[PDB]
Amino acid sequence: FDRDRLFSVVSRGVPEELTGLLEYLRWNSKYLTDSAYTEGSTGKTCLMKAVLNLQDGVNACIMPLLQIDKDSGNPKPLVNAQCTDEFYQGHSALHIAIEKRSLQCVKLLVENGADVHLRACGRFFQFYFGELPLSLAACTKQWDVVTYLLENPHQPASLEATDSLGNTVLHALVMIADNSPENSALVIHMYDGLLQMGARLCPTVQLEEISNHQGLTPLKLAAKEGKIEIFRHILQREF
């Protein structure tokens, strides 16, 4: 089992061809997160390759890979491996699952130890979505994934979490807003929805008062970016 074979196998979504992988790993004291099983420039793992080749929301190598990884006794679980190159830095299988708009796959990953606060901060994403799984799910308007991330019993995502810019999901939404009537309406429903859920999930937290590394709340950030409709909406929330 060299890397080439595994990635081929996994790309084709044929779990049956993983026969002997576990034995090979345990015999040699190796893990699927090892340099050897990782693409040398990017750190792209076999599980990432799997989620990149989803067929109709699924890929039948995914759970086998997770199980083999667990059974191999891996100290640094494959589920939370991150891309290492400049362009995709921090990108995890969970981010790819959300980009692919697959709730099925998000669940499978989270149920098996996905860290819901890993940051994708590479040069390609500066579109920028706030580097966090929840902020990506919100920015791409995925209601089913957003509520799963917030409510699941394994690893609930925090609405207060911030990225390397100090941005919450609320700042991220301000960032992706267009000034088109229909887009801003949808972004407003997401902004309000998250806050409505926050009144229940974090009853005491003033999420809209959290400010940036640039000292900007979502309101002030909205003003800075020229986002009139979002700005005026955030104000009427107060008043």
Side-chain angles (χ1 to χ4, degrees), residues 126-178:
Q126 322 284 207
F127 70 97
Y128 170 71
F129 51 81
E131 302 183 3
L132 293 158
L134 177 60
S135 308
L136 170 63
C139 289
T140 60
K141 304 171 197 72
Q142 291 182 70
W143 286 91
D144 65 341
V145 171
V146 166
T147 75
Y148 181 76
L149 285 178
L150 290 172
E151 309 286 343
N152 80 90
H154 308 104
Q155 238 276 241
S158 167
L159 282 164
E160 315 174 64
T162 51
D163 71 3
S164 67
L165 300 183
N167 289 156
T168 72
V169 57
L170 294 196
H171 303 269
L173 257 359
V174 170
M175 289 315 290
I176 50 93
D178 300 320

Short mmCIF file of all heavy atoms in Angstrom, two decimals, residues 126-178:
data_model
loop_
_atom_site.label_atom_id
_atom_site.label_comp_id
_atom_site.label_asym_id
_atom_site.label_seq_id
_atom_site.Cartn_x
_atom_site.Cartn_y
_atom_site.Cartn_z
N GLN A 126 -9.01 34.35 1.12
CA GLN A 126 -8.76 35.65 1.72
C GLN A 126 -9.47 36.71 0.92
O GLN A 126 -9.69 37.80 1.46
CB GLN A 126 -7.26 36.02 1.75
CG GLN A 126 -6.27 34.91 2.04
CD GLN A 126 -6.20 34.50 3.50
OE1 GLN A 126 -5.15 34.02 3.95
NE2 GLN A 126 -7.29 34.66 4.23
N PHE A 127 -13.11 32.72 -2.25
CA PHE A 127 -13.70 33.75 -1.31
C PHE A 127 -13.41 33.50 0.19
O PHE A 127 -13.25 32.37 0.65
CB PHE A 127 -15.23 33.94 -1.56
CG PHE A 127 -16.09 32.75 -1.14
CD1 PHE A 127 -16.72 32.73 0.10
CD2 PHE A 127 -16.27 31.66 -1.99
CE1 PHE A 127 -17.51 31.64 0.50
CE2 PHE A 127 -17.05 30.56 -1.60
CZ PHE A 127 -17.67 30.55 -0.34
N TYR A 128 -13.31 34.60 0.91
CA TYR A 128 -13.17 34.61 2.35
C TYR A 128 -14.52 34.27 2.99
O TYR A 128 -15.56 34.78 2.57
CB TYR A 128 -12.70 35.99 2.80
CG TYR A 128 -12.75 36.18 4.29
CD1 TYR A 128 -11.85 35.52 5.13
CD2 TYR A 128 -13.72 37.01 4.87
CE1 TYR A 128 -11.90 35.70 6.50
CE2 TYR A 128 -13.78 37.19 6.23
CZ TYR A 128 -12.87 36.54 7.05
OH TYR A 128 -12.96 36.72 8.41
N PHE A 129 -14.50 33.40 3.99
CA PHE A 129 -15.76 33.01 4.64
C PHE A 129 -15.64 32.98 6.16
O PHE A 129 -16.52 32.46 6.84
CB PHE A 129 -16.23 31.66 4.11
CG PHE A 129 -15.15 30.57 4.15
CD1 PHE A 129 -14.87 29.89 5.35
CD2 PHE A 129 -14.43 30.24 3.00
CE1 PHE A 129 -13.90 28.88 5.39
CE2 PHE A 129 -13.44 29.23 3.03
CZ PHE A 129 -13.18 28.55 4.24
N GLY A 130 -14.57 33.52 6.71
CA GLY A 130 -14.37 33.52 8.15
C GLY A 130 -13.73 32.26 8.71
O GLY A 130 -13.85 31.99 9.92
N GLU A 131 -13.09 31.47 7.82
CA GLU A 131 -12.17 30.38 8.18
C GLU A 131 -12.63 29.26 9.09
O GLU A 131 -11.85 28.38 9.39
CB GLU A 131 -11.02 30.92 9.05
CG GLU A 131 -10.20 32.03 8.39
CD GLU A 131 -9.03 32.48 9.25
OE1 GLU A 131 -8.81 31.90 10.32
OE2 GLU A 131 -8.34 33.43 8.85
N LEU A 132 -13.88 29.30 9.54
CA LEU A 132 -14.38 28.37 10.55
C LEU A 132 -15.49 27.63 9.81
O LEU A 132 -16.14 28.21 8.95
CB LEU A 132 -14.95 28.97 11.85
CG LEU A 132 -13.98 29.68 12.80
CD1 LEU A 132 -14.77 30.64 13.71
CD2 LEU A 132 -13.19 28.69 13.64
N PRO A 133 -15.70 26.34 10.12
CA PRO A 133 -16.80 25.53 9.54
C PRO A 133 -18.17 26.17 9.64
O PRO A 133 -18.90 26.21 8.65
CB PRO A 133 -16.73 24.23 10.35
CG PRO A 133 -15.24 24.08 10.57
CD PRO A 133 -14.86 25.51 11.01
N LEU A 134 -18.52 26.66 10.82
CA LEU A 134 -19.79 27.35 11.01
C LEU A 134 -19.94 28.60 10.13
O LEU A 134 -21.00 28.82 9.55
CB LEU A 134 -20.04 27.67 12.51
CG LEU A 134 -21.32 28.46 12.81
CD1 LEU A 134 -22.60 27.71 12.36
CD2 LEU A 134 -21.40 28.85 14.31
N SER A 135 -18.89 29.42 10.05
CA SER A 135 -18.93 30.64 9.23
C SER A 135 -19.01 30.32 7.75
O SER A 135 -19.73 30.98 7.00
CB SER A 135 -17.72 31.55 9.52
OG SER A 135 -17.59 31.79 10.92
N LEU A 136 -18.26 29.30 7.32
CA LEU A 136 -18.41 28.81 5.94
C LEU A 136 -19.86 28.34 5.63
O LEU A 136 -20.41 28.66 4.58
CB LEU A 136 -17.43 27.66 5.67
CG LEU A 136 -17.59 26.88 4.39
CD1 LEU A 136 -17.36 27.76 3.15
CD2 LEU A 136 -16.62 25.68 4.39
N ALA A 137 -20.43 27.56 6.54
CA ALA A 137 -21.79 27.01 6.38
C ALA A 137 -22.84 28.15 6.31
O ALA A 137 -23.77 28.14 5.50
CB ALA A 137 -22.11 26.03 7.55
N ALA A 138 -22.64 29.16 7.16
CA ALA A 138 -23.48 30.37 7.17
C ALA A 138 -23.34 31.23 5.91
O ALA A 138 -24.35 31.65 5.32
CB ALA A 138 -23.13 31.20 8.41
N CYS A 139 -22.09 31.52 5.52
CA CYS A 139 -21.82 32.31 4.32
C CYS A 139 -22.37 31.69 3.04
O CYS A 139 -22.75 32.41 2.12
CB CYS A 139 -20.31 32.57 4.16
SG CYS A 139 -19.70 33.75 5.39
N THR A 140 -22.37 30.35 2.98
CA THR A 140 -22.88 29.64 1.81
C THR A 140 -24.36 29.25 1.99
O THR A 140 -24.90 28.45 1.24
CB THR A 140 -22.01 28.41 1.49
OG1 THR A 140 -22.00 27.50 2.59
CG2 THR A 140 -20.55 28.83 1.10
N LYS A 141 -25.00 29.84 3.01
CA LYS A 141 -26.44 29.70 3.27
C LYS A 141 -26.90 28.25 3.43
O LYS A 141 -27.96 27.89 2.91
CB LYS A 141 -27.26 30.33 2.15
CG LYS A 141 -27.00 31.82 1.82
CD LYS A 141 -27.79 32.09 0.52
CE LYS A 141 -27.34 33.34 -0.19
NZ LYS A 141 -26.00 33.19 -0.84
N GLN A 142 -26.13 27.42 4.14
CA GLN A 142 -26.53 26.02 4.28
C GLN A 142 -27.22 25.81 5.62
O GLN A 142 -26.57 25.48 6.59
CB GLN A 142 -25.32 25.09 4.15
CG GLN A 142 -24.75 25.05 2.75
CD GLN A 142 -23.60 24.09 2.67
OE1 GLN A 142 -23.81 22.89 2.74
NE2 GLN A 142 -22.37 24.62 2.56
N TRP A 143 -28.54 25.95 5.64
CA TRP A 143 -29.32 25.94 6.87
C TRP A 143 -29.26 24.62 7.61
O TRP A 143 -29.18 24.59 8.84
CB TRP A 143 -30.78 26.34 6.59
CG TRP A 143 -30.85 27.80 6.35
CD1 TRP A 143 -30.75 28.44 5.12
CD2 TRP A 143 -30.97 28.83 7.34
NE1 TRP A 143 -30.81 29.81 5.31
CE2 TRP A 143 -30.96 30.08 6.65
CE3 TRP A 143 -31.11 28.82 8.74
CZ2 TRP A 143 -31.09 31.31 7.31
CZ3 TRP A 143 -31.25 30.05 9.41
CH2 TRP A 143 -31.22 31.28 8.69
N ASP A 144 -29.30 23.52 6.85
CA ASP A 144 -29.24 22.19 7.42
C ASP A 144 -27.87 21.94 8.10
O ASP A 144 -27.81 21.42 9.22
CB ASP A 144 -29.64 21.13 6.37
CG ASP A 144 -28.68 21.03 5.18
OD1 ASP A 144 -27.87 21.96 4.90
OD2 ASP A 144 -28.72 19.97 4.51
N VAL A 145 -26.78 22.36 7.46
CA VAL A 145 -25.44 22.23 8.06
C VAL A 145 -25.21 23.17 9.27
O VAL A 145 -24.72 22.74 10.33
CB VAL A 145 -24.33 22.43 6.99
CG1 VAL A 145 -22.92 22.52 7.66
CG2 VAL A 145 -24.41 21.32 5.93
N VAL A 146 -25.59 24.44 9.12
CA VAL A 146 -25.53 25.42 10.22
C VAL A 146 -26.19 24.89 11.49
O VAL A 146 -25.58 24.88 12.55
CB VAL A 146 -26.18 26.78 9.83
CG1 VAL A 146 -26.44 27.69 11.06
CG2 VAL A 146 -25.29 27.49 8.82
N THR A 147 -27.45 24.45 11.39
CA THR A 147 -28.15 23.98 12.57
C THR A 147 -27.54 22.67 13.09
O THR A 147 -27.42 22.48 14.31
CB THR A 147 -29.73 23.95 12.43
OG1 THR A 147 -30.13 22.86 11.63
CG2 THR A 147 -30.23 25.20 11.79
N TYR A 148 -27.11 21.79 12.19
CA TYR A 148 -26.39 20.60 12.66
C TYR A 148 -25.12 20.98 13.48
O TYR A 148 -24.88 20.48 14.60
CB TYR A 148 -26.03 19.65 11.50
CG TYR A 148 -25.31 18.44 12.06
CD1 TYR A 148 -26.01 17.44 12.71
CD2 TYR A 148 -23.92 18.36 12.04
CE1 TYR A 148 -25.37 16.35 13.27
CE2 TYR A 148 -23.27 17.27 12.60
CZ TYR A 148 -24.01 16.27 13.23
OH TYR A 148 -23.38 15.20 13.79
N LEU A 149 -24.31 21.88 12.95
CA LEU A 149 -23.10 22.29 13.65
C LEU A 149 -23.42 22.86 15.04
O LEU A 149 -22.71 22.55 16.01
CB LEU A 149 -22.30 23.31 12.83
CG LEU A 149 -21.53 22.74 11.62
CD1 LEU A 149 -20.84 23.87 10.87
CD2 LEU A 149 -20.54 21.63 12.02
N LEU A 150 -24.47 23.69 15.11
CA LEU A 150 -24.84 24.35 16.36
C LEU A 150 -25.43 23.43 17.42
O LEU A 150 -25.19 23.63 18.62
CB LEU A 150 -25.82 25.50 16.11
CG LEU A 150 -25.33 26.77 15.40
CD1 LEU A 150 -26.52 27.66 15.11
CD2 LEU A 150 -24.28 27.52 16.25
N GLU A 151 -26.21 22.44 16.98
CA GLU A 151 -27.08 21.63 17.86
C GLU A 151 -26.61 20.20 18.14
O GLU A 151 -27.13 19.53 19.03
CB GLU A 151 -28.49 21.55 17.27
CG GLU A 151 -29.09 22.90 16.90
CD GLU A 151 -29.53 23.69 18.12
OE1 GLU A 151 -29.67 23.10 19.21
OE2 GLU A 151 -29.76 24.91 17.98
N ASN A 152 -25.64 19.72 17.37
CA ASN A 152 -25.25 18.32 17.49
C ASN A 152 -24.66 18.01 18.89
O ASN A 152 -24.07 18.90 19.51
CB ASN A 152 -24.27 17.95 16.38
CG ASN A 152 -22.84 18.39 16.69
OD1 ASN A 152 -22.08 17.64 17.29
ND2 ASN A 152 -22.49 19.62 16.30
N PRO A 153 -24.81 16.76 19.38
CA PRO A 153 -24.35 16.48 20.73
C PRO A 153 -22.84 16.15 20.85
O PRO A 153 -22.35 15.98 21.95
CB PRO A 153 -25.20 15.27 21.12
CG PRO A 153 -25.39 14.52 19.87
CD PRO A 153 -25.39 15.56 18.75
N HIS A 154 -22.13 16.07 19.72
CA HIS A 154 -20.76 15.57 19.73
C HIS A 154 -19.76 16.72 19.88
O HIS A 154 -18.89 16.67 20.74
CB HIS A 154 -20.45 14.75 18.47
CG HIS A 154 -21.44 13.66 18.20
ND1 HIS A 154 -22.40 13.75 17.21
CD2 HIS A 154 -21.65 12.48 18.82
CE1 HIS A 154 -23.16 12.67 17.23
NE2 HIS A 154 -22.72 11.88 18.20
N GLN A 155 -19.93 17.76 19.06
CA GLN A 155 -19.03 18.90 19.03
C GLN A 155 -19.83 20.14 18.57
O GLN A 155 -19.79 20.52 17.41
CB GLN A 155 -17.88 18.62 18.07
CG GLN A 155 -16.46 18.68 18.69
CD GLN A 155 -15.89 20.10 18.73
OE1 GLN A 155 -14.86 20.38 18.12
NE2 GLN A 155 -16.57 21.00 19.47
N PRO A 156 -20.58 20.77 19.49
CA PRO A 156 -21.39 21.92 19.03
C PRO A 156 -20.48 23.07 18.67
O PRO A 156 -19.51 23.30 19.38
CB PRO A 156 -22.27 22.25 20.24
CG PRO A 156 -21.56 21.62 21.44
CD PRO A 156 -20.73 20.49 20.93
N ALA A 157 -20.73 23.76 17.55
CA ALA A 157 -19.88 24.88 17.17
C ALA A 157 -20.27 26.08 18.01
O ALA A 157 -21.45 26.24 18.35
CB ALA A 157 -20.02 25.21 15.68
N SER A 158 -19.30 26.92 18.36
CA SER A 158 -19.59 28.13 19.11
C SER A 158 -19.80 29.36 18.22
O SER A 158 -18.97 29.69 17.37
CB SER A 158 -18.50 28.40 20.15
OG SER A 158 -18.70 29.71 20.62
N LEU A 159 -20.92 30.03 18.41
CA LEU A 159 -21.24 31.29 17.72
C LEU A 159 -20.24 32.40 18.03
O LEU A 159 -20.08 33.32 17.23
CB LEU A 159 -22.65 31.75 18.10
CG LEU A 159 -23.83 31.04 17.43
CD1 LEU A 159 -25.12 31.33 18.17
CD2 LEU A 159 -23.94 31.47 15.98
N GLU A 160 -19.57 32.29 19.18
CA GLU A 160 -18.57 33.27 19.65
C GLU A 160 -17.19 33.02 19.09
O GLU A 160 -16.29 33.84 19.27
CB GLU A 160 -18.43 33.25 21.19
CG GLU A 160 -19.73 33.21 21.98
CD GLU A 160 -19.48 33.03 23.50
OE1 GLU A 160 -18.87 33.94 24.15
OE2 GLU A 160 -19.91 31.98 24.04
N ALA A 161 -16.97 31.87 18.45
CA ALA A 161 -15.62 31.57 17.95
C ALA A 161 -15.19 32.63 16.92
O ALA A 161 -16.02 33.15 16.17
CB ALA A 161 -15.55 30.18 17.36
N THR A 162 -13.90 32.94 16.89
CA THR A 162 -13.37 33.95 15.98
C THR A 162 -12.22 33.39 15.16
O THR A 162 -11.53 32.48 15.59
CB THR A 162 -12.84 35.19 16.74
OG1 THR A 162 -11.94 34.75 17.76
CG2 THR A 162 -13.99 35.98 17.39
N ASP A 163 -12.01 33.94 13.97
CA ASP A 163 -10.94 33.50 13.10
C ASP A 163 -9.69 34.34 13.35
O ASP A 163 -9.63 35.11 14.32
CB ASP A 163 -11.39 33.54 11.62
CG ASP A 163 -11.54 34.97 11.08
OD1 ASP A 163 -11.25 35.95 11.81
OD2 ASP A 163 -11.95 35.13 9.91
N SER A 164 -8.70 34.21 12.47
CA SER A 164 -7.41 34.86 12.69
C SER A 164 -7.47 36.38 12.48
O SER A 164 -6.48 37.08 12.71
CB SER A 164 -6.33 34.24 11.78
OG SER A 164 -6.63 34.54 10.42
N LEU A 165 -8.62 36.88 12.05
CA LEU A 165 -8.86 38.32 11.90
C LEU A 165 -9.68 38.84 13.07
O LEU A 165 -9.99 40.05 13.14
CB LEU A 165 -9.61 38.63 10.58
CG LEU A 165 -8.94 38.23 9.25
CD1 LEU A 165 -9.78 38.69 8.07
CD2 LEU A 165 -7.52 38.83 9.16
N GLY A 166 -10.08 37.95 13.96
CA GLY A 166 -10.97 38.33 15.05
C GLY A 166 -12.44 38.35 14.66
O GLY A 166 -13.28 38.77 15.45
N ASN A 167 -12.76 37.86 13.46
CA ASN A 167 -14.13 37.83 12.96
C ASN A 167 -14.97 36.65 13.41
O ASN A 167 -14.57 35.47 13.23
CB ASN A 167 -14.15 37.84 11.43
CG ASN A 167 -13.73 39.15 10.86
OD1 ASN A 167 -13.26 39.21 9.73
ND2 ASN A 167 -13.87 40.21 11.64
N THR A 168 -16.15 36.97 13.93
CA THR A 168 -17.19 35.99 14.18
C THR A 168 -17.94 35.67 12.87
O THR A 168 -17.77 36.35 11.84
CB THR A 168 -18.24 36.47 15.21
OG1 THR A 168 -19.06 37.49 14.61
CG2 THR A 168 -17.61 36.97 16.52
N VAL A 169 -18.80 34.67 12.93
CA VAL A 169 -19.68 34.37 11.82
C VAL A 169 -20.48 35.64 11.40
O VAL A 169 -20.77 35.84 10.23
CB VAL A 169 -20.62 33.17 12.15
CG1 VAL A 169 -21.45 33.43 13.42
CG2 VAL A 169 -21.54 32.84 10.95
N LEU A 170 -20.79 36.51 12.35
CA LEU A 170 -21.55 37.74 12.04
C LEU A 170 -20.72 38.74 11.18
O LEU A 170 -21.25 39.33 10.22
CB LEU A 170 -22.01 38.42 13.32
CG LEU A 170 -23.05 37.68 14.19
CD1 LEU A 170 -23.64 38.67 15.15
CD2 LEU A 170 -24.16 37.02 13.39
N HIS A 171 -19.44 38.90 11.52
CA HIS A 171 -18.52 39.67 10.70
C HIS A 171 -18.37 39.04 9.31
O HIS A 171 -18.31 39.76 8.29
CB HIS A 171 -17.12 39.74 11.33
CG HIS A 171 -17.07 40.32 12.71
ND1 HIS A 171 -16.89 41.66 12.96
CD2 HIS A 171 -17.13 39.72 13.92
CE1 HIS A 171 -16.85 41.87 14.26
NE2 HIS A 171 -16.99 40.71 14.87
N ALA A 172 -18.26 37.71 9.28
CA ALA A 172 -18.07 36.99 8.02
C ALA A 172 -19.24 37.28 7.08
O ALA A 172 -19.03 37.51 5.89
CB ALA A 172 -17.96 35.49 8.27
N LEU A 173 -20.45 37.32 7.61
CA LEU A 173 -21.66 37.56 6.83
C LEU A 173 -21.69 38.98 6.25
O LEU A 173 -22.12 39.22 5.11
CB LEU A 173 -22.89 37.36 7.71
CG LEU A 173 -23.82 36.13 7.70
CD1 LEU A 173 -23.52 34.96 6.68
CD2 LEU A 173 -24.11 35.62 9.15
N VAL A 174 -21.27 39.93 7.08
CA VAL A 174 -21.10 41.31 6.62
C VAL A 174 -20.12 41.34 5.44
O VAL A 174 -20.36 42.04 4.46
CB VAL A 174 -20.65 42.25 7.80
CG1 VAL A 174 -20.22 43.63 7.29
CG2 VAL A 174 -21.78 42.36 8.85
N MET A 175 -19.04 40.57 5.55
CA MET A 175 -18.02 40.48 4.51
C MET A 175 -18.52 39.92 3.18
O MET A 175 -18.07 40.36 2.14
CB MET A 175 -16.80 39.67 4.97
CG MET A 175 -15.91 40.36 6.02
SD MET A 175 -15.57 42.08 5.63
CE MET A 175 -14.49 41.93 4.21
N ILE A 176 -19.44 38.95 3.21
CA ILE A 176 -19.88 38.31 1.98
C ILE A 176 -21.14 38.93 1.39
O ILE A 176 -21.53 38.61 0.26
CB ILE A 176 -20.12 36.77 2.11
CG1 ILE A 176 -21.00 36.45 3.31
CG2 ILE A 176 -18.80 35.97 2.06
CD1 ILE A 176 -22.42 36.35 2.96
N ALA A 177 -21.78 39.82 2.16
CA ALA A 177 -22.94 40.55 1.67
C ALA A 177 -22.61 41.28 0.35
O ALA A 177 -21.52 41.83 0.19
CB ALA A 177 -23.44 41.52 2.72
N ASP A 178 -23.54 41.18 -0.61
CA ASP A 178 -23.60 42.04 -1.81
C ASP A 178 -24.56 43.13 -1.44
O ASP A 178 -25.32 43.00 -0.46
CB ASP A 178 -24.21 41.29 -3.01
CG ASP A 178 -23.43 40.04 -3.41
OD1 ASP A 178 -22.18 40.10 -3.39
OD2 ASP A 178 -24.07 39.02 -3.76
#
